[PDB]
Design a protein around this ligand. Structure first.
Ligand SMILES: CN[C@@H]1CCc2c(ccc(O)c2O)[C@H]1O
Length: 281
């Protein structure tokens, strides 16, 4: 009386994740007014979210509901690698967007020279390659495996797939994928808020006769509340074996997945995108 309807939520999540990013990509590609230097980062982020929604989520839902992994071990490793790659690429693209806004606001005269159509491509490719070296290489070369007794039994059986990793890979992956972008974004947005407050102070000092907090709160709170709880327990469960159960780990990981759906509502609600969406359908 549960699994007959518990998949409806997963189906709705998949539909929303696919549709939002497909609409964003179609709006950027089809309408010529939108194409800009900053809009390419949104394109890469939407591509990462689309790949996640198309590949990662449905197989995880099937594994959860059916309780068995009917597919082979090779496909299981492929799925894990794709998952890690997509997560890393999405978070690093968010950090790139934040840094771009920092450079746009803090130094207005020199903004044009720093960012050009031929410099954005190299940055995006570097981000995706750095993401790829984290996921595919350590997994396919069999460096992340664990040596405790249950790990060998999990690896041998072809019917089951449970994540088992050693200490070094977990720590290094968490540090590379989450914490450094978090620090960079924190510093960036603190500086941006200071500049905005100074400008409002000047506009109040002249012509004498609150709004940035809402935007910054949305932008930081969504990402932090979505992704921070997962990585803390990700680091924790390795140092202390009995501390963290697997069900909470899976629940937090699936909470992290949903964050890909909220990105179009955050980064794509400008008037130009509204006009493009209105014209599209
Ligand atoms: C299958 N779940 C994976 C397992 C570990 C992991 C994830 C995401 C980013 C990382 O850097 C990780 O090390 C999770 O999505």
């Amino acid at each position: 009386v549960w699994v007959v309807g518990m998949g409806i939520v997963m189906s709705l999540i998949v539909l929303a994740i696919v549709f939002g990013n497909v609409l964003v990509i179609t709006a950027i590609a089809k309408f010529e007014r939108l194409q800009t230097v900053t809009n390419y980062f949104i394109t890469s982020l939407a591509c990462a979210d689309l790949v996640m929604g198309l590949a990662v989520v449905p197989f995880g839902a099937a594994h959860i509901l059916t309780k068995t992994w009917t597919f082979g071990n090779f496909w299981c490793e492929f799925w894990t690698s794709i998952d890690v790659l997509c997560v890393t690429a999405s978070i690093e693209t968010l950090c790139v967007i934040a840094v771009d806004r920092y450079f746009a606001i803090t130094s207005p005269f020199k903004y044009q020279s720093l960012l050009t159509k031929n410099k954005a491509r190299v940055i995006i490719l570097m981000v995706w390659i750095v993401s790829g070296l984290t996921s595919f290489l350590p997994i396919q070369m069999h460096w992340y495996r664990a040596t405790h007794q249950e790990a060998i039994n999990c690896y041998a059986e072809e019917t089951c797939c449970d994540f088992f990793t050693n200490q070094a890979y977990a720590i290094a992956s968490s540090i590379v994928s989450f914490y450094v972008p978090l620090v960079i974004m924190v510093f960036v947005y603190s500086r941006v808020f200071q500049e905005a407050k100074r400008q409002l102070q000047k506009i109040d000092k002249s012509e004498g006769r609150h709004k940035a907090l809402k935007t910054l709160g949305i932008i930081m709170g969504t990402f932090t509340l979505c992704w921070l709880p997962f990585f803390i327990v990700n680091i924790v469960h390795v140092i202390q074996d009995n501390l963290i159960r697997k069900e909470v780990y899976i629940l937090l990981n699936w909470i992290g997945y949903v964050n890909s759906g909220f990105n179009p509502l955050i980064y794509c609600r400008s008037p130009d995108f509204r006009i493009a969406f209105q014209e599209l359908l």
